[PDB]
Structures are given as structure tokens and as C-alpha cells.
Symmetry: D2
């Protein structure tokens, strides 16, 4: 049996147990600011990621076991002009050596808009900009090896309000669930789908966040993570 757990109710200025990639910084309020802000305004063409430093053991070939996990986090997206929001934020799992990929609508996750099993990426996206591969309207998606989500639901942005997300994986049913609640408006969203982590991901992964602002100067928004908890448990075989 193996377990891994961590809690941040805020982030400290030089978080050595996070691997910060691209533009990410920690703000003086203790938030993970994934995309750049200059003089109070979000900057275009920005991409940042943040991963927990330790690999997570999500399945074991030696014992044929697969882990459960539950992660919770709070985030804020603030678009000065809601009609020109872009591009969004994702929680993801990836190989341990993962590096940022293309900005904009590919969210730092993928090098192109195609499906590739060797990406070894599972993500939950909060997608604020309609690309050519996207459904109509802002949406939450489950992504497996592609920016073209396996499943999406409609999601209405409450601009500059705190969103509370919970993502869980139940190995026994191969089910990934993602929910988002805005306590400020009493609105909530949820979806789930079958995702077989043992078939998709390597035995060890890194987990974390990515976000990107739009690739034109007027399509900007912030992507800040305020708090994050993660728990995983890899059971003994039966």
C-alpha cells in the first residue's frame, strides 16, 4: 500500500516542492498566478504551469493495482472583457518529465490539435475560448491524449469569482469525475467519464496545473490558483 497527500491553503513565495514552468509566479497574496499580469492587467500570449515536485504512483505493474485519487482546488479567472476571454486552465496528469507545449488554445498541454496515445496526458480543462475543435460556448472538458475533449459540458464563467473544483478517480469503475461550484452564485457543474488510467498513463506521473492567455492582445484573462489539496492511495492486491 502507498499513499501520497499534500495540502496548500495558500502558496509561499519560493515553493521548492512545486515545479514552476513558463510564466508562473507566486503573488504577494499567496496565489499561484499561472499567466502573467503586468500593472494589474493580464498579459496576452502567456503560458504557465505548476506541478507537484514528487511523482505520484498511480498504478503498479508488479502488483497489478491502480490508485484512487481525489484533488480539490480553488481558482479565479478574471477577464477584463468577458466576451474576449481566452484561453483557460487545466488540471492534468502527465509523464514525470513533462514540459510545456504550445500556448493559446492548446493550453500548454499539446504540441498540436491531434490525438496521440504517446502524449500520456489526462486533463480536466476549463476552456474559455472556442477553438475550431471546441463545442459552442465556454465548457469544462475531460481530455485524454488530445485537446479535443472526450466529453464536455457547458460551463458559465462567473467572472472574478472563486471556483471550487473537485476531481476524483475511482479505479474500480475507471471513472474520472470533475465538479465545479461557485458558492457566490450557488451554481454548479459536474461531469464524469470512463478513463482507464492504467492503459493511458505511465506508472508514475506528475500532477498539476496549466493555463494560457489568448494569442491576440485583446483576448486576455488571469488564471490564478488559490489553494490545492491532493490525496492518492495505491492499494495492496486482493
Amino acid at each position: 500500500k502507498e499513499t501520497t497527500s499534500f495540502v496548500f491553503t495558500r502558496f509561499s513565495p519560493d515553493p521548492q516542492n512545486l515545479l514552476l514552468q513558463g510564466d508562473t509566479v507566486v503573488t504577494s497574496s499567496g496565489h499561484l498566478q499561472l499567466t502573467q499580469v503586468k500593472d494589474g492587467e493580464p498579459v496576452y500570449s502567456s503560458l504557465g504551469r505548476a506541478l507537484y515536485y514528487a511523482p505520484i504512483h498511480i498504478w503498479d505493474s508488479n502488483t497489478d493495482t491502480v490508485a484512487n485519487f481525489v484533488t480539490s482546488f480553488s481558482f479565479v479567472i478574471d477577464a477584463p472583457n468577458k466576451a474576449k476571454a481566452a484561453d483557460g486552465l487545466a488540471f492534468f496528469l502527465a509523464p514525470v518529465d513533462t514540459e510545456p507545449q504550445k500556448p493559446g488554445g492548446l493550453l500548454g498541454l499539446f504540441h498540436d490539435d491531434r490525438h496521440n496515445k504517446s502524449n500520456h496526458i489526462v486533463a480536466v480543462e476549463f476552456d474559455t475560448f472556442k477553438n475550431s475543435w471546441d463545442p459552442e460556448g465556454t465548457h469544462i472538458g475531460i481530455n485524454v491524449n488530445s485537446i479535443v475533449s472526450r466529453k464536455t459540458i457547458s460551463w458559465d464563467l462567473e467572472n472574478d469569482e472563486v471556483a471550487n473544483v473537485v476531481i476524483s478517480y475511482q479505479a474500480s469503475t475507471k471513472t474520472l469525475t470533475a465538479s465545479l461550484v461557485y458558492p457566490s452564485s450557488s451554481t454548479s457543474y459536474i461531469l464524469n467519464d470512463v478513463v482507464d488510467l492504467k492503459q493511458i498513463l505511465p506508472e508514475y506521473v506528475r500532477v498539476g496545473f496549466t493555463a494560457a492567455s489568448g494569442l491576440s492582445k485583446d483576448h486576455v484573462e488571469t488564471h490564478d490558483v488559490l489553494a490545492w489539496t491532493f490525496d492518492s492511495d495505491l492499494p495492496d492486491p486482493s
Copy 2:
């Protein structure tokens, strides 16, 4: 600071840390069978409840603090005829000395269909029968001091399939959230609302489940709870 936590991944016979009320028994598979089964068939006019034995400290007048909690559970409803499903299951919080009330559509929670502040009940119902006070169709509801829910959403019962429920209370925003997922069909539901526990409930409560079958012989279903976790935390004052 106080915390309380428990996990049941299955239930034992004569569970001395549960207060079983009405018809509830534990099955040989280790499930909490809230309503009666005779020769493999659900019995009508059955009502059963199950509460954790220890009171939970949900707020403290001495320090003016209010607890957070998160509970998860799995349940199954099996109706021989899905169109004549009745009456449903609820998770609830109530005064420590709570006793079962009326069966059928009142779900063992209430003595009548009226609102009364002295009930001191907060419940999340999974309501399988349209009573005269109900919205159209099967629904999930947040109930405060009445069987007439404060808020409902539509929910389609997946007959004899496992439902995974998560109910959480965030004291800082006075927000109660309930979600339900069916991993078998990849279907999911969520709602939330403002419920001020400090104004509604006593400082200590008991928490648990109630369920009732229909009050006519053809409106029957089982209500089984398979697993249950609960965690609460009452913080120090600021």
C-alpha cells in the same frame, strides 16, 4: 480545534457505533438495508434510519465557530417497476435525540408536510416519488425544516445501479453542495445552496440516513447504503 472522522467500506452485523432505527438491518453482503426485503422483494410501508452513534459538533457558541464537513457514500435503489418507484432516501442532520417520523413521502424525517423551525432538520433527499408538494419527476433536493425542498434538480434514477454521493458544507460561504455520480452510465448531477447551519441546527447533531418504501403495495423499492465516509472540522476562532 476539533475534528471527527469515520470510514465504513462495508458494514458489520450489530454495528454498535451506529444507531439503527425502524426497519434497518445489515445484509450478509455488509450493506445497510434501510427498508425491508422479504423473499428477495422490497416490502411496502417500510421505514428505516441509521445514524452515527457519536454526536457531531457542527458549531460552537462559546467560540462563535462553525464546522466544515464532507461526507461520501454509495447507495443503490432497486425498484421492480421503475415507474412505480417510491419513496426515496436522504442523508440528514438532526438533533441528537432524533427519532423516526412519518413513513412514505415524508421519508421518516417529518411528522407532516409543513415547515417548522423547531424540526431542526437539514437533509439531502433522493426523491423517487412525486408527492403533492414535489416538483415534476424524480429529483435531488436540499431540505431545511420541511419536506418541501428549498432547492431541487432533476435526477433520473438508474435502477439497481450504484450511486456515489458527496455532500459538503463550507462554513465560510454557508454553502451545502450535493453531487451524485453513476459510474455505470457516466451520468452525474450536482446542486448547491446557502444553508446557515448555525441558524438552523443545534450545536451538536446526529448525522445519517433515512429511507422509506411506498405506502401502496405496488410502489416499492429497496434503499441500500454500501459504504460511508464522514469528516468534519471545527476550527479555532480567528
Copy 3:
């Protein structure tokens, strides 16, 4: 699998999730005052206990499993005259319906000084008075069904200083361990012994504290518990 867990970093004035027996009260500083204090002075012939309200599932005959547990607590004993300290404090496990027994050197645990398998008591005692059955000097003891400890070690009371205790049970080796640290003086103690909980105790028990002041007017001391954490885990069968 079943788990039970709780934390008190201090105690609130009417703790409804504790079963208080005999003289126990909660002080305005939020301590569990097990033996009586009148006008700042400890009272003789006082006995008090405090149990967690929910029974703990320590073994299961259905699945042939036995629980691990770990408990930590902080306590203070203040004897106005250290040479006339009596009688001490214990942590214990007992049947669910346990009631206080004889005061003084029997510590509220036992009706007499004999061994009896039907007592179903396991205790760790902090014994400040030499009875006829006691080793020389103040001592920590592991007690099983008798006030005559199975094993003792010497322990010097540091008067009115906080003691930090950890008691743990490892089912796989049938080993109970108890340690005490005084951080103020950098002094520590530890012992362990074989106790087979499945053979000694019922499937469910209550857990908590007991303490008694001396049975003569000049042999008095306080017995206060400042904080308490408990965790138990009853595993699935192999």
C-alpha cells in the same frame, strides 16, 4: 475496512460527544478536569472518567480482523505536596457500557485488586501512589484485567508540567506501546508488552480516561487532560 478518528486540541464546556462519568468537568480553560478542584485545591476521594461517545470497533469475528490504533494526549498532575501524591490517571479500553468502579488506588477501573477475565479492561496507568500490589516508586504500567500491572517502568512525576503521551497498538505483533515525554525537561519514558486484544476485549469498546485522588485528606492532586487525538483502523481481511 472501518476507521474512527477524532482530535480535540482543547475541550468545549458541554462536550456531548464525550461521556463524562463521576466528578469530571470541563474547565473554563478548556481542560478535562477529571478529579474535583474546590477553591483552587484538589479534593480527596474524587473519581472522574471521560469516554469518547462512539464505540470503537477493535476486532471483527465476521472477517477475523483486528484493529490497529494510536492515541496521543497531554495531561498535567499538580500535587500540592509531591510526597503525598495520589492516586493517578489512566487511559483505558473497556466494554461499551463501562461504569466507574472503586476509587483511590483502583483508579475507577476495578472493583477489587484481583485478576478477572470478565473485567475486559486494558489500561495504561500513570500511578502516583504505592499500593500493596505496586512496585517501588511512581510508575507507568500496562494493565490487563487487573490493577496489578503486567509490566511497569519507573516514572518521576514532574509536578504541574505538561506530559505528552502516545499509546499505540500493532495488531500484527499484538504489541501495546506507551511513551511519555516532558518537553520542559527533555525527559522521556517508554514501555511495551504483548496484549492480545481479540482475546481480552469485546468486539466494540469505549475508550478514554480515568483518574482518582487519594482516599485520605492530605493525599491529593489534580488530573487534567489538555488535548486528545485518537485513530483506529480495522482492516479488510487478507
Copy 4:
């Protein structure tokens, strides 16, 4: 507030969330074999370490807070000839970029036998060989920036028997406590000392194990870690 937690009840063959240094391997039984075994026999001049991959946040200069931690582990030392046992095993905290130092009696921890504040090492040693700087006999020691322990106690190696260790740090009293139990014989040991982590260590450290066999061919023993749990909590300021 930040917390970090992990559990290994056994180790899997390529543990990517551990940083293995020197000779360490994982055995087919799932043990961390810190020093080399060849044809069933321990090899001399062997040094191995194993660190958890993620840095641990032990204090924060921004908020002036200091973390608590508790770690537990099980280990076995098997010396073919008990009279020629060498050199031992330690649990330690060190800078994030820590690398193995000198083998033998310096335990991979130190470059020499001198005290140096820039080492930034806190360790608990299980020392099986009397060096020139050591007390007489096998001992447990608390070491701060030197192989010359601040405090030692006598400890008798129970050859090839499982030892259960618990090491804890209480920030409010600056107290480090270490205990060892052999459940097979019901023998136990404990010591504690004041160690100010904020003054000794950097804000982030890595934690883990080191062990070394003797520097002559006949002074050999195994050093195997069977299981490890770690929990740390960095509180919010007052």
C-alpha cells in the same frame, strides 16, 4: 497552512518518488536495501541513501512559522557476527541538494568528524560500531551538524529482528523525540532533545535514510527499511 504526507507499507521495484543514492536497491520482497548484499551476504564498504523526492517545507521565513512532523518506519539489521557489526543506519533531514558523504562510521552524512553549522543536518542514528568519537557500546543518538551526537542512549541490537521507530518534532517546544521498539522481545528505547529546526535547517529539506557497512571485510551487516510513513504540518501564523 501546508501539509505533506506519505505512506509506504512496502516498496515497489523502481520507486520514482524516492531519490536513491549510492548502493540502495529495492529487493524482490519490497524492502529498501540500503547496503549491498552479494550471494546472501552483506558487502563491506557499502553506503546507500534514500530520500523522499519532494522537498518538505519545515519552516517559513515569510510567516515566521515552523512545522511539526512525525515519521514512523520499520528496519532490520542482520550482522553475520554481532561482535563485528558496522556501521549503522540513520534517519535524517538535510538540504534539498544533499549528496552522500563519507562511508563507514560517518554514515554517508558527514565529510569528517567535526562540527560545522553549514552541514545543515539533523539525524537520528542507530550506531552499531564504536568510533573514536562514540560512547561505549551500540547506541541511538541525536546528531545536529556533526557525527558526534548531542545525546545518546544505550541500545542493544536484536540481530535480524524488526525494529519499529517513531521520530517526531514538536515545534512549540522545539523537541525532537525518537523511539525504537522490538515487538518480538518487548524491548524499547526513547530519547529526546531540544533542537531548533529554524536555526539549524534551511526552509526546505529532503528527508530519508542512510546506512553504511564497515570499512573492513569482516565488519558487515545489512540495513533494510521495510516500511515508512511521514506527516508534516506547517501551520498558519497567529
